[PDB]
Structures are given as structure tokens and as C-alpha cells.
Amino acid sequence: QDLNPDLILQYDIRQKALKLTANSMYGCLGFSYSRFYAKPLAALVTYKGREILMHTKEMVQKMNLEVIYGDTDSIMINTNSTNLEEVFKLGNKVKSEVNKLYKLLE
Amino acid sequence: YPHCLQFYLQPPSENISLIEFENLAIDRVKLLKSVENLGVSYVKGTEQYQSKLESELRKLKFSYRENLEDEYEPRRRDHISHFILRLAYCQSEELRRWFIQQEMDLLRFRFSILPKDKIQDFLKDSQLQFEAISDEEKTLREQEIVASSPSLSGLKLGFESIYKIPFADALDLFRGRKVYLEDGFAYVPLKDIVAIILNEFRAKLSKALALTARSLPAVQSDERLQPLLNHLSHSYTGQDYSTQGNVGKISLDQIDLLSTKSFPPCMRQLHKALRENHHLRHGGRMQYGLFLKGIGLTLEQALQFWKQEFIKGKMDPDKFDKGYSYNIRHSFGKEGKRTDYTPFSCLKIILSNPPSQGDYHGCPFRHSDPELLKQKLQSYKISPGGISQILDLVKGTHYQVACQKYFEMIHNVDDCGFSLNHPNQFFCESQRIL
Numbered sequence: 001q002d003l004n005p006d007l008i009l010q011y012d013i014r015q016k017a018l019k020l021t022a023n024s025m026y027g028c029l030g031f032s033y034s035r036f037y038a039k040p041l042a043a044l045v046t047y048k049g050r051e052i053l054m055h056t057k058e059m060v061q062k063m064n065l066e067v068i069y070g071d072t073d074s075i076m077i078n079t080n081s082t083n084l085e086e087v088f089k090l091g092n093k094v095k096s097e098v099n100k101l102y103k104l105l106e
Numbered sequence: 107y108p109h110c111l112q113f114y115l116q117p118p119s120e121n122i123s124l125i126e127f128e129n130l131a132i133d134r135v136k137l138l139k140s141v142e143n144l145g146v147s148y149v150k151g152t153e154q155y156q157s158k159l160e161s162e163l164r165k166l167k168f169s170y171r172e173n174l175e176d177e178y179e180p181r182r183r184d185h186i187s188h189f190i191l192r193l194a195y196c197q198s199e200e201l202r203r204w205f206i207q208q209e210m211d212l213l214r215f216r217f218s219i220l221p222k223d224k225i226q227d228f229l230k231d232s233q234l235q236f237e238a239i240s241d242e243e244k245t246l247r248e249q250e251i252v253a254s255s256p257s258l259s260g261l262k263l264g265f266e267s268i269y270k271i272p273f274a275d276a277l278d279l280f281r282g283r284k285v286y287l288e289d290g291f292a293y294v295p296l297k298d299i300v301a302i303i304l305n306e307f308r309a310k311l312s313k314a315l316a317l318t319a320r321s322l323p324a325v326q327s328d329e330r331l332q333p334l335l336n337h338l339s340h341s342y343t344g345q346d347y348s349t350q351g352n353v354g355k356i357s358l359d360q361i362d363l364l365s366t367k368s369f370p371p372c373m374r375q376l377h378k379a380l381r382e383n384h385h386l387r388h389g390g391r392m393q394y395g396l397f398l399k400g401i402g403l404t405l406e407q408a409l410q411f412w413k414q415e416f417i418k419g420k421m422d423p424d425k426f427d428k429g430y431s432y433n434i435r436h437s438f439g440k441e442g443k444r445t446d447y448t449p450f451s452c453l454k455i456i457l458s459n460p461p462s463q464g465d466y467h468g469c470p471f472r473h474s475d476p477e478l479l480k481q482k483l484q485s486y487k488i489s490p491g492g493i494s495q496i497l498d499l500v501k502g503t504h505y506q507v508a509c510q511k512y513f514e515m516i517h518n519v520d521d522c523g524f525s526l527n528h529p530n531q532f533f534c535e536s537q538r539i540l
């Protein structure tokens with residue numbers, strides 16, 4: 001803390017730009033529209049993504065909650081709870097466990 | 107189809123009808139689920155296990171020694187059913203592990219079925235070479251085999267067959283220096299033979315299932331096989347058969363005694379909650395209502411029962427009529443089927459709509475913690491040892507088998523004679539006990 005708010009906004013903008021650049025990393029490799037069109041490499045990446053998201057699905061089923069929707073960019077989770085803080089800490093614990101299952105995933 | 111056991115590494119290329127396709131899929135799903143439940147309940151080697159699973163096979167006609175009947179239908183059924191389960195199960199690592207466990211149980215049992223005379227030609231048909239040694243070789247090398255053998259007590263080299271194997275096939279076996287080696291060839295007893303073959307078979311199945319997982323997106327474009335192949339194992343009842351349209355004579359007053367004598371723990375506690383509260387949430391209300399529909403209660407009896415219970419609920423009877431009587435009549439009558447026309451199956455009760463605060467539906471074994479399970483079991487007066495294996499089974503996530511054991515304990519019997527999947531089946535069997 002104790003930083004100029006303008007520089008804070010600059011840092012936020014840079015972080016968001018890094019986020020979108022990362023998200024588009026896979027974009028630059030899989031498209032016939034791209035220079036580096038790699039059908040097998042893109043297929044392998046998509047297969048791994050589907051596998052990991054689906055694994056998260058069954059195991060979050062194991063941890064006694066229920067999932068209702070997700071396609072590689074978001075996961076809908078029902079809670080069966082009415083305490084917002086309890087729901088938030090449930091999300092925190094599932095985030096921590098999935099982070100220790102897969103190291104670099106955020 | 108040259109022999110009964112067979113290793114599944116050549117997919118079929120025939121043409122079959124959709125009805126036969128679904129029949130094979132459902133039958134083999136039932137067989138594997140029965141194998142899972144029986145292996146959980148019993149020890150894998152007991153004659154009770156062997157005979158019960160033999161009877162399961164006979165009623166599902168999946169394997170038998172070669173004859174006129176065996177050649178055409180059963181082994182072909184096994185083949186296509188196993189491959190369609192490959193398509194169904196290659197989706198996830200967890201499902202692959204589950205499938206591997208049950209198929210190893212199945213294959214070990216089948217190998218135990220095969221008589222010793224035919225195992226030679228089975229290994230020959232298996233296309234991977236193994237040479238059995240002669241009696242003279244066995245007698246000559248008995249001392250070497252016993253000296254280099256594992257902790258098997260004594261010098262006794264009994265009737266168990268000994269084979270000759272390339273050393274590279276038994277790496278983990280010989281690398282512990284627990285076997286004799288002769289010119290790069292090993293000599294091994296039957297238990298380790300079957301262990302080696304099952305490890306190789308699990309390796310090949312792992313690779314093949316991974317490859318089929320790579321092949322799923324192309325083969326799922328069909329519309330008549332997607333809704334099945336998504337859910338052969340996940341959410342399909344193994345012919346629960348407690349379908350709507352049953353008959354029976356039920357007295358309305360007797361509902362309390364029938365609940366305390368013949369209801370599975372979930373439904374028993376749901377009925378007690380109804381009696382002590384005169385009100386239920388949507389899930390429990392619908393669950394118990396359609397259960398009472400299934401058990402044989404008629405429409406007028408059900409309507410009068412619910413109206414009488416809401417008399418103690420303190421809402422207006424005409425409000426009851428307008429609000430609910432429509433819903434109960436719809437559940438007893440017209441379409442909306444598979445959700446209101448049917449009695450709930452146990453696998454559905456466990457996998458759908460977990461209860462929340464203020465809810466009492468859902469199988470308690472899966473939807474309540476072990477301390478509250480213990481409190482409920484104490485309230486139902488079961489022996490502490492019985493409660494102990496109940497909690498052990500709960501730790502093993504075999505909720506249906508736990509409910510089974512609760513059934514025998516509450517009925518003071520040894521074996522219920524089936525594997526429960528439907529609360530209406532539970533109630534029907536309890537009435538069969540009279």
C-alpha cells in the first residue's frame with residue numbers, strides 16, 4: 001500500500017494486459033487463421049484441458065457439492081448453503097486443493 | 107471367438123440392431139455393478155462369492171465352457187458389451203480405475219472357472235508365448251525352485267503348474283531375487299502367473315482406454331448413442347424394476363408401524379420428520395409421496411393421508427386442495443414422466459439433490475456425517491459391532507451395501523438374498539419377510 005493511485009491503476013492495467021496476452025497464447029497457435037497452425041499441438045492442449053476440467057468436475061462431486069455448467073472458461077457451482085462467508089471459504093478450500101493438485105493453475 | 111476367456115484387443119466389426127446394442131450395454135453394466143457390490147460385501151475367494159456370481163452370470167449368460175450354445179451368442183455378447191463399456195468408461199481417469207478394478211475381479215474369477223486342462227490352450231490362444239515345463243524338468247529343478255522361491259513354506263512343490271518365461275516379462279518378479287533363472291528363462295507358480303498376466307492386461311487396457319479417450323470426440327456425433335453412452339454407469343439403475351403400476355393392500359393407519367418395521371433408513375427418518383413436523387420441503391415431499399405411490403397405496407388413500415397430515419399443519423384445507431391435490435393427481439396420472447410418474451431409485455436418491463439445512467431427504471449414509479449416522483443407528487437400536495461395520499462400509503463409500511447390512515441387522519437375518527437399489531424393493535422384501 002502507500003502508493004500513488006495513478007500508479008496503482010497503471011499496475012492494474014498492466015496485470016490485465018498480461019492476463020489477456022496469456023489467454024491469447026493458445027489462440028496464436030491453434031487457428032488456420034494463424035501462422036503457426038499446429039493441429040496436433042492444439043489437439044493435445046485441448047485434450048489436456050478437457051481432462052483436467054472434467055477431473056475437477058468429478059472430484060468436486062466427491063467433496064459433496066454439485067456442479068451444473070462449465071466449458072473451459074468458467075465453472076458454475078451450487079452450494080446448498082446460505083452463509084456467504086461459508087460459501088467463500090468453501091471456494092477458497094477448493095481453489096487451494098486444486099492448486100496443490102495442479103501447481104501452475106490459477 | 108476361439109476360447110471363453112479372451113483378451114479384448116480386437117474390436118468387432120459386425121452390424122447389430124439398436125435394441126441388441128442397448129441390451130448388451132445394460133446387461134454388462136449390471137454384471138460389473140454386481141461384481142463390484144459382491145466383491146465389496148464378501149471376500150473374493152469364498153464359495154458363496156463364487157456361486158453367487160456364477161448365478162449372476164447364468165442369469166445374464168456372459169460366459170460358460172464351450173458347447174453349441176457358447177460359440178455364437180454369449181462370447182460375442184461379452185465382446186461387444188466390453189467394447190461399448192470401453193466407449194462409456196474411457197471418459198475419465200476415475201471411471202477407468204473403477205472399470206479396471208471390476209474387470210480384474212471378473213477376469214480373475216473367470217480364470218478360476220477355467221479347468222487346468224484348458225489353461226494351456228488359453229495361453230496359446232493368448233498370442234503371447236509361455237511354455238509349461240515337463241514333469242521331468244519339474245522334478246529335476248524342484249530343489250532349485252524351492253531354494254530360490256519366495257517365503258512359501260517348505261519344500262512342497264505340489265500340483266501347481268510351472269511355466270517357462272522370458273526374463274524380461276517378469277521384471278518386478280525376478281528383480282527381488284525370489285525366483286530361479288536358467289539361461290534367461292524363469293519358472294513360476296500359478297498365482298504369480300495370474301498376477302503377471304493381470305498386470306500386463308491392466309497395462310494394455312490402460313493404453314487402449316487412453317487411445318479410445320482420444321477417439322471419443324469423433325464417435326460421439328451420433329444422436330442415438332450420446333444419451334446412453336454418457337450415462338451407462340453414472341446414473342442408470344440396474345433394472346430396479348420397482349416401476350409404477352404395482353398392486354397391494356395397505357391400511358392407512360398402519361403407516362407408522364410399517365415405517366418403523368419396513369422402511370429404509372432414509373425413508374424411515376423422512377416419515378418420522380413428517381410426523382414430527384407435518385411439513386416437508388419440495389424434495390422430501392415429492393420423494394415420500396412417490397414412494398407411497400409406489401408401495402401400492404391408492405390415489406384416494408394418498409390424498410386423504412396427506413390432507414389429514416396437513417390438518418395438523420394448520421393451513422386451510424381448500425388451500426391444500428388447490429395447491430397440492432393437483433400435484434398429487436398429476437404425479438399419479440398423466441405425463442411429465444420419469445420425474446413424477448416413477449418411484450425414486452437409490453442411485454438417484456444418492457446422486458441427485460443433496461439435502462441442505464431444513465431438508466431430510468437424501469440417503470443419510472451419503473448425506474450426513476458419521477457422528478450423526480452413529481446417533482441415528484443408536485436411536486434405531488442396532489448392535490455396536492454392526493454399527494462398526496456400517497461405518498467401515500460408509501468409509502468405503504458403499505452406501506447401498508451399508509443399507510443392505512442395516513436391513514439384515516434390523517430384520518435379525520444373515521443375508522437379504524439380493525443387492526438393493528430401490529427403496530420400494532427394500533419395502534417389498536421387508537413385506538416378504540412378513
Ligand code: SF4
Nearest residue numbers: 370372452455469509
Ligand atoms: S441405499 Fe438407497 S434405499 Fe438405502 S438409505 Fe440410501 S438411498 Fe435409501
